Every structure is written in C-alpha cells, then in structure tokens.
Design a protein around this ligand. Structure first.
Ligand SMILES: CC(C)CC(CC(C)C)O[C@@H]1O[C@H](CO)[C@@H](O[C@H]2O[C@@H](CO)[C@@H](O)[C@H](O)[C@@H]2O)[C@H](O)[C@H]1O
Ligand SMILES: NS(=O)(=O)c1ccc(-c2ncc(Cl)c(Nc3cc(C4CC4)[nH]n3)n2)s1
Ligand SMILES: NS(=O)(=O)c1ccc(-c2ncc(Cl)c(Nc3cc(C4CC4)[nH]n3)n2)s1
Lengths: 260, 262
C-alpha cells in the first residue's frame, strides 16, 4: 500500500517504518481512538497467496497471547484484501543499527539488554511458544534503554543463518536461548562467532564447528555464560529464556552463571 | 449488556468482573485474536444518552493515549451499545485486598505507592489528571504488580479520597492525584482512612479544613513524614506529579527521609 491508505476505514497509514521478512511496518493513526500505532501489512505479492496469509494470521494470534513490556504488543488484526496486524508503536531503533554505529555495548548495557530479552522471551516460552528468529533486527531499543521483542513471524537466507540454532539448521525454547547467546556474543565483543561469505557456511559452522573464543578483556563469568548457551546439544543449555535471564542476573551481581 | 452476547460478532462477554459508574467491566474473549480480554461496556441505562456516550468516548481516547505496564492497556473501541476492549489483568482491587488484610506491611504499602506514582506520572507527563485515584481503581496482581484503571472523569466515591483544591472546584492538577494517593498511603499503613463521617459533604469539608489525625507511633518517622507532606492542603507545597512522589517513596524505601517537594 501507499501513504494515504485508510485500512478498514480506521487505520490511515502515514510513514513506512521498515520492510521486514514478509510484511511492511507502518507508522499509522487509529481514527476511532485517535492514537498513533504501528501497522504490519503483507507485501502486495504475498497478500494474494493463502500460505502467506495463514502464516501472517499465526503471527497475530501468537503475539496476542503475550503480555510483557518487553514484547511489542498487538491490539488488532484485520483484512481490507490487505491483511494487516495493528500493534503498539515503539519509538526505538533496532539493535541492528545500534551495533553498526557502536560496534559493541558496555558490560552493563549488554547484560541489561540480555536479561531484558530473556525476561521477555520467558513470557513466550511459558505459553509453549518458540520465537525461532532471535536477532538484533528483531530487538528494538528505545532511547530510555528499553528492549522490545518484535517479529514472531516464524514462531512454532543469511539473516536467520547468522544466529540459527544447530538443531534448526539440521531440520525448541532452548533454540531462542542459543540465538540470544549469539546476539550476546556480538553485543559484548563487536564481531559474530561464525562468519563466512555464504549463508550455508555460517549455518554449517553452527553445527560441526565449535564457537571461536571471546576476547580476554571480557570477565570469566560473562565468557562462561556465552559458552553454556552456545552448546550443540539442546539439553546441555538453558531450557528457557527465564533460567538464562536468571543466569545473566548472577553475572551482573558478580556471581558465576549456574548449570541448567 | 447480558452474559453470552458476542460484541460486533467478535467479543464474547463471559463474566461480569465489576460495575463502575458509567459502565461494566467484563471478562471476555476476542474470537479473532483468540485471547481473553477485558471489555468495558456502557450501562444499558446510559447506552443511548449523548452526554454519557461522549464521556465514554473520551475515557476510551484518554486511556489509549497511555502506554505503560502500570496502566491497563486499550486494544480496541466499538459500538455493537459502546464497548472498550482492554488488557485482561489477573488482579484484585486494593479496595478488597485491604478489606481482608486490614493494613498492608510497610514493605508492600511503599512498593504499591511507588508503582502507582510511576504509572500516574505517564498521565501527568501527557498533561492529564486522573481525578479519581482510590483503592478500587488500583489493581494488585498475585506477583504484586499495580495496574491503574478508570480514566472516566480524567481532565487535561471521590469524597473519601478527594483533594482539598478539587473539593473547592479548582482546576485539576497532578498534585491532586498525589494527595489522593497519600490518602491511599495513609489507609494502607494505618488500616483506616484519615477523614470519616456519614455524608460526603462532611468528608469533603474535612479534606479542606480538618488536619489528618496522627499516624500510629509504631510506624517509622520517615514513613509518617512522607504521608504528612503529601496530605498538605496547598497543592503548591506538595509533590508536583507521580514521578516526584515515587522518588520520595524510593528514598523512604532506602531508609532515608523523604525529600522536600520542588
Ligand atoms: C506489594 C503489593 C503489590 C501488594 C502485595 C499484596 C499483599 C496482600 C501482600 O503483593 C505482594 O507483593 C510482593 C512484592 O512485589 C510479592 O513478592 C515478590 O516480590 C518480588 C519483588 O522483587 C520478588 O522479590 C519475589 O517474586 C517476591 O515473592 C508477592 O508475591 C505479592 O503477593
Ligand atoms: N518487525 S520487523 O520487521 O522486525 C522491524 C524492523 C524494524 C522495525 C522498526 N524500526 C524502527 C521503529 Cl521506530 C519501529 N517501530 C515499531 C515497530 C513495531 C512493531 C510492529 C513491528 N512497533 N513499533 N520499528 S520493526
Ligand atoms: N475500572 S473499574 O471500574 O475501576 C474496576 C473495578 C474493578 C476491576 C477489576 N477487578 C478485578 C479484576 Cl481481575 C479486574 N481485571 C481487569 C479489569 C480490566 C479493565 C478495566 C481495566 N483489566 N483487567 N478488574 S476494574
């Protein structure tokens, strides 16, 4: 769609915020409530296909099950036909753009935003859900330092391949924990663990190859925590975002990260 | 607005949670998103009156304007009778909590006071005054989270918690909400409201002229001071907003004296 488009005679679009996996994120107005909201609309070509509509209907129902200030909230879902998902409008920048300008984040910043993400993901984990795509691009950062987990689009290309779980790369809530570890690694050092020219290389590295060592400037408790999340076996790592967030909180207090 | 009823063919009303002044609070189901929501429906008596319809539309718009975990979120607004789709909170009004407990422990009372201050500061920063802060409007979850509700009489029942200036027909200000919260604070720590009597006029006149009765000597002085400052009759000599109030509570929690309002 374009700027002047009023979805179902209520949601008048304004600015195009981003262009995600299958849908476009839009800055919009609710004519009934008179408030600014974010609207996710399916791309012109995907709006015609029923496999892309039933994948988008799933994102709506999944996100609406979650209630946490660390999860971009869902208000509505409609079809005008253009399938749209009405959400909480967040004044933030993705961790994608943050780490591009800053390289890495300070020990205080990284561990605050890691626990924030774990406490956010545990809400999704306790409901029996798995995000399946935890990456800086799906983590929004407001100027007040608040994390907002977005895009549950594939909840059960090189983008997902850079932080993919080894079991997923082969064919669970431990996977979101794993991915967040890879996210943590990049945020604490300023360079991803597995890196290559292609997507299939980075994904194959995640299975057979062991993660490269972290810089020695990093404390032992932070180093250990990244290594417990980055194990090939999904049993040898934290079964959910919560036990992980609990282990992040220990490293924040000066303590060691526990064994799951 | 009867039980079974499915609003706009989407929101099935299940259980009447509460009955306010303008409308009813219902535990409902969003058949579209497949989630359990709370629906505020206009009382059938007022459902067709234009004065109440505008008052309900304003409440819908005011609440939707606020985004904070300590305030119950707005999802949708419709007219099937007007209805307001909101976040479903598994909580209990401070009203009923205090009826069972009598008085909250200093640790709990100060935690609920801080949370309410922080939540109201969002509305105050937006330039809105709640105008009806009372224990019945403060939801408490089993995890101990405060959820602020009912912006029905908010400006850009009341009697027991009304601010002196608010009783004197003065313009609304965030300091008025600060006073009302101090009345909730006085009640939470002592198990008794400061001003009493049959008839609202007496209670309202007590908020204007009568000084609040002394708090139990069993209480810490840092706590007693915080309540005493918030209950000043002059809003200029009181905490400006929910934020400054919450900061003074944070100082008391840390075992310090509350800072003097700016
Ligand atoms: C303070 C208000 C909201 C009123 C109070 C109700 C009254 C009737 C007793 O609610 C209690 O609040 C405390 C403090 O948050 C909770 O403990 C947890 O507090 C946490 C806060 O840090 C954690 O330490 C831990 O989960 C505690 O158990 C209780 O589970 C909850 O029942
Ligand atoms: N979802 S995505 O495609 O990963 C994605 C990529 C980039 C996104 C982005 N960037 C900047 C801002 Cl200011 C923003 N605001 C939002 C977004 C949302 C929710 C509806 C998705 N609420 N507020 N969003 S969102
Ligand atoms: N708003 S009121 O009339 O003061 C009022 C009095 C009592 C209320 C109450 N009691 C128990 C529960 Cl479990 C509950 N849950 C809610 C309610 C909402 C909607 C209204 C914001 N979300 N979750 N609400 S609400």
């Amino acid at each position: 769609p374009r700027v002047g488009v009023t979805l179902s005679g209520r949601y008048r679009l304004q600015r195009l915020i981003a262009t995600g996996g299958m849908g476009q994120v839009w800055e919009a107005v609710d004519n009934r409530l008179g408030r600014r909201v974010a609207v996710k609309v399916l791309k012109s070509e995907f709006s015609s296909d029923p496999e892309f509509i039933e994948r988008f209907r799933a994102e709506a129902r999944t996100t609406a099950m979650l209630n946490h200030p660390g999860i971009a909230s869902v208000h509505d879902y409609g079809e005008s036909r253009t399938a749209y998902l009405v959400m909480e409008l967040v004044n933030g920048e993705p961790l994608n753009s943050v780490l591009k300008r800053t390289g890495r984040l300070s020990l205080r910043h990284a561990l605050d935003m890691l626990e924030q993400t774990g406490r956010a993901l545990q809400i999704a984990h306790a409901a029996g859900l798995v995000h399946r795509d935890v990456k800086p691009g799906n983590i929004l950062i407001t100027p007040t330092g608040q994390v907002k987990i977005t895009d549950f689009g594939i909840a059960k290309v090189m983008g997902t391949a850079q932080y993919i779980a080894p079991e997923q790369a082969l064919g669970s809530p431990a996977s979101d924990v794993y991915s967040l570890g890879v996210v943590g690694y990049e945020a604490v050092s300023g360079k991803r663990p597995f890196a290559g020219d292609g997507a299939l290389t980075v994904a194959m590295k995640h299975i057979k190859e062991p993660p490269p060592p972290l810089p020695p400037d990093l404390p032992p408790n932070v180093r250990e925590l990244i290594e417990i999340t980055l194990v090939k076996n999904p049993a040898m790592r934290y079964r959910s975002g919560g036990p992980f967030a609990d282990a992040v909180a220990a490293v924040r207090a000066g303590r060691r990260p526990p064994r799951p």
